[PDB]
Amino acid sequence: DEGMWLMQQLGRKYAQMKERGLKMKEYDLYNPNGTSLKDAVVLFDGGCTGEVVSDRGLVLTNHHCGYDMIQAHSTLEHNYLENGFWAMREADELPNKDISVVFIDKIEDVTDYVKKELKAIKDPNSMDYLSPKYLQKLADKKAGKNFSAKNPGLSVEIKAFYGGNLYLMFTKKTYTDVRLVGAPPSSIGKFGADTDNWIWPRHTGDFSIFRIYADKNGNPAPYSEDNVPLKPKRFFNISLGGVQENDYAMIMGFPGTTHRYFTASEVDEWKSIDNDIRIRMRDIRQGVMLREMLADPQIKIMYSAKYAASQNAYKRAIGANWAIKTRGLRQNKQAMQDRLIAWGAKQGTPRYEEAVHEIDATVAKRADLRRRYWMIEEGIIRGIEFARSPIPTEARKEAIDKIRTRYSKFANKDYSAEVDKKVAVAMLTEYLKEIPYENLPLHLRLVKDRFAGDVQAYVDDIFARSVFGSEAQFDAFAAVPSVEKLAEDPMVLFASSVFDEYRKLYNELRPYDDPILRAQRTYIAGLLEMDGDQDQFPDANLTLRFTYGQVKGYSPRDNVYYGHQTTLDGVMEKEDPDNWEFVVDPKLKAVYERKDFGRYADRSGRMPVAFCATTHTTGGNSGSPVMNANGELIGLNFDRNWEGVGGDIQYLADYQRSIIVDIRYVLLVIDKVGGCQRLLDEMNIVP
């Protein structure tokens, strides 16, 4: 069901959640002065979510969340990334540098305090009401000086909500000794990772396991061997009961951003500039890279990761545009604003209509600038590798060595000048079609002026004459440098020129953000006064939220249905030993052959892998705990389907799903692949 809800909003949603199957008492989910299930949810390393699952501080998160830590502890000799890692006793758990887990100890509405303090600011158009600096000053003031000394490991922050109409103060408890406990092999943690990115059905065992360490009274402490596991105030019980179609499910985590209060003019802008340009430009770049990778197996090895990276936001854009085209996104936002405008007229209050028209005006006014910026960003800054070639400055020589370092990083083991030329020719062709001469970065005027419109000639010239055009040409330069040659170097001139245009566009565009922000404060205030907050969630902003719904599949298209649950049978169907992403771990294969599923499979002997649910999630919900009607953990959220990515603007009940690793599968992999029984023994596994 729709919405990423504040914890303060639980009372307002509780009836709707019970109608969907919630059985918990409200107080047990969240409450302000006691212990609640909220106390088992953590912000894992500043972006991802995780969850406490034992009375000795075991934390579950996604493999993709744990990846960097697993990587860091890997050596080609103990390659934990590839083989999995299973500590067989607490003493074998691996400390990590610059990691943290954050608990949300307390939440308090401070809207009256902040609004009163804002009256001091004379200028009605000051943006201090959204300023992190300003808000931190208010938080610090409110908590007292010495707060910190009287509160081991606690800090405070104030955040804006509802466009500046509501403020909460959070009290955070931060732990920095968080040790790696367990991880599956990558073939399990990243199964289908690229090819199945954004896809349901999904077959990835995307998990990893950490443990919070602390002082002997459970306070935060920097890493020390005298530290001991945290004995947390609350942890999740783990359900063995599984899921069935239509079961209630809920998620708590830290979603980053949403745009629920877009005007119709902002939807049209997101379609026709940001998405349309990203889709066009990336389809060009990718098409060239594909052709090259298919022609040459060394190019495949060099460019596969850059290709997959480009594909990630491309696939998102595709999905968003599908939603705008087929699911009525614009009309939804149009109806929202027409309702408020007609109401405002009844109240004799034209300020809401003025706000919408101000947003409309600003969006109209920036259109050509924003189009220029997205063209350069997608076409060149991200599009063309040689845009990010070295730009100098700067008797010696030390500077040559400094340039050499940047050059080697540019033209590294994954870079092909020949691939980059082909990509640049195609990208610059489209770029020059769309951007008129008068608005080109200056160096690109040379295509018309010096090369007679021949982009291939132009790009061939940059590489022929640049000191960065090849290692040979770099070495000839240093060796025998020239100040001179460098000042005129066509690659340096290209790179300088495009980054100059990028910067100027950025700087001209930035001022347009503020009138929109100011107008949205008024717009959202309107919407709330008129209809209330019960069916109007605040946009995500990296803070703790809950969402609820049901375990359920969907129909992507006529006569096709995806169910709610994948199985280990589906892993085996996808097996491909010659594709790294569809390798099946030999222990798991052996498990499937023997049906050695223990107590983790369903009564018909099918072993679950993942499931999907109608919860409303976005980026920042990776790793989030998925709870059943009684608050027990039934899975770990890891993705969302491409059909649903338009959900950041308008929730799509019939298409949008969260993609979730089944906790039964997590347990299976712990048990049968890891052989880490002690982790099972320390959890409270319930029927």
353 binds K ion (CB under 5 A): no
Verify binding: residue 257, K ion, rule CB under 5 A: yes
List Cα–Cα distances, 476 to 3, 267, 482, 494, 652, in angstroms.
Answer: 61, 53, 10, 21, 59
Decide whether 199 or 476 has the Cβ nearer to a second copy. Answer: 199
Total residues contacting a second copy (rule CB under 8 A)? 19
By the 10 Å C-beta count (0-12 exposed, 13-18 middle, 19+ buried), 244 is classed as exposed
CA atoms within 13 A on the CB side of 597: 20
Among 398, 561, 594, 604, binds a second copy (CB under 8 A): 561
State the catalytic residue, choosing from 1, 39, 63, 64. 64
Give the nearest distance from C-beta 9 to K ion in angstroms: 20
- Per-residue contact flags (x/-) with K ion for residues 180 to 199, judged by CB under 5 A: ------------------x-
Count CB-CB contacts under 10 A for residue 540.
Answer: 23
* Range 153-212, binding a second copy (CB under 8 A): 201, 203
Residue 618 interacts with, from K ion, a second copy, none (CB under 5-8 Å by kind): K ion
Smallest distance, a second copy to C-beta of residue 425, A: 14
Inter-residue long-range contacts of 436-442, CB under 8 Å, 24+ positions, other chains counted:
439/372, 440/501, 441/376, 441/380, 441/497, 441/498, 441/500, 441/501, 442/497, 442/500, 442/501
36 part of the active site = no
Half-sphere exposure of 176 (CA within 13 A, CB side): 9
As a whole number of angstroms, the distance between CA 284 and CA 375 comes to 13
**Per-residue x/- marks for K ion, 591-630, CB under 5 A?**
---------------------------xx-----------
Considering only residues 565, 621, 641, 658, which one is a binding residue for a second copy as defined by CB under 8 A?
565
Taking a C-beta distance cutoff of 8 angstroms, is the pair 175, 111 a contact?
A: no
Under rule CB under 8 A, residue 557 binds a second copy = yes
Contacts of 435 (CB under 8 A, 6+ apart): 372, 375, 376
In angstroms, give the least distance from the CB of 450 to a second copy. 28
622 is catalytic: yes
52-111: contacts with K ion (CB under 5 A): none
DSSP β-bridge partners for residue 157: 170
CB 321 within 8 A of CB 271: yes
* Interacting span for a second copy (CB under 8 A) from 85-93, 310-318, 552-560, 666-674: 552-560
Residue 257 binding target from K ion, a second copy, none, CB below 5 to 8 Å by type: K ion
Task: Pick one of 256, 328, 392, 563: the residue that binds a second copy (CB under 8 A).
Answer: 563
Options 1, 196, 206, 274, the catalytic residue: 206
What is d(CA 448, CA 72) in angstroms, rounded to the nearest whole number?
Answer: 50
Q: Give the residue with the Cβ less far from a second copy, 292 or 539.
A: 292
* CA–CA gap between residue 332 and residue 650 (Å, rounded): 8
Q: Are 614 and 620 in contact (CB under 8 A)?
A: no
Q: Give the nearest distance from C-beta 356 to K ion in angstroms.
A: 23
Phi-psi domain of 6 (left: phi exceeds 0; alpha: psi -120 through 50; beta: other) = beta
Residues 222-261, one symbol each (x = binds a second copy by CB under 8 A, - = not), give: ----------------------------------------
Catalytic residue among 100, 497, 622, 624: 622
The binding track of 29-48 with respect to a second copy, each residue x by CB under 8 A or -, is --------------------
What is the CA 518 to chain-centroid distance, rounded? 26
Pairing type for strands 625-627 and 248-253 reads antiparallel
Distance CA 66, CA 180 (A): 8
Of 474-482, 490-498, 567-575, 677-685, the window that binds a second copy (rule: CB under 8 A) is 567-575
Q: Which of 226, 559, 603, 604 binds a second copy (CB under 8 A)?
A: 559
Site string for K ion, 632-651 (x = CB under 5 A): -------x--------x---
Residues contributing to the site for a second copy (CB under 8 A): 201, 203, 291, 294-295, 553, 557-563, 565-567, 569-570, 573
Q: Which residues are annotated as catalytic?
A: 64, 206, 622
Footprint of K ion (CB under 5 A): 198, 257, 618-619, 639, 648
